[PDB]
Amino acid sequence: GSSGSSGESLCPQHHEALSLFCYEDQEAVCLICAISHTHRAHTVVPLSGPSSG
Ligand SMILES: [Zn+2]
Ligand SMILES: [Zn+2]
């Protein structure tokens, strides 16, 4: 017997709740990350969906 499932999803570098996803790369990234991407002309949209912000 053995198990090892990861629950919450946090950036492997920032370790912060991932509330975004980069299309181009097709991977999930955190908020801080976005900055870089959004700067490199990378498409990024919120997972949870639309919010007040
Ligand atoms: Zn990150
Ligand atoms: Zn990107």
Curated annotation (Swiss-Prot):
<feature type="zinc finger region" description="B box-type">
    <location>
        <begin position="8"/>
        <end position="47"/>
    </location>
</feature>
<protein>
    <recommendedName>
        <fullName>E3 ubiquitin-protein ligase TRIM39</fullName>
    </recommendedName>
</protein>
<feature type="binding site">
    <location>
        <position position="33"/>
    </location>
    <ligand>
        <name>Zn(2+)</name>
    </ligand>
</feature>
<feature type="binding site">
    <location>
        <position position="11"/>
    </location>
    <ligand>
        <name>Zn(2+)</name>
    </ligand>
</feature>
<comment type="similarity">
    <text>Belongs to the TRIM/RBCC family.</text>
</comment>
<feature type="binding site">
    <location>
        <position position="39"/>
    </location>
    <ligand>
        <name>Zn(2+)</name>
    </ligand>
</feature>
<comment type="subunit">
    <text>Isoform 1 interacts with MOAP1. Isoform 1 and isoform 2 interact with CDKN1A. Isoform 2 interacts (via domain B box-type) with CACTIN.</text>
</comment>
<feature type="binding site">
    <location>
        <position position="14"/>
    </location>
    <ligand>
        <name>Zn(2+)</name>
    </ligand>
</feature>
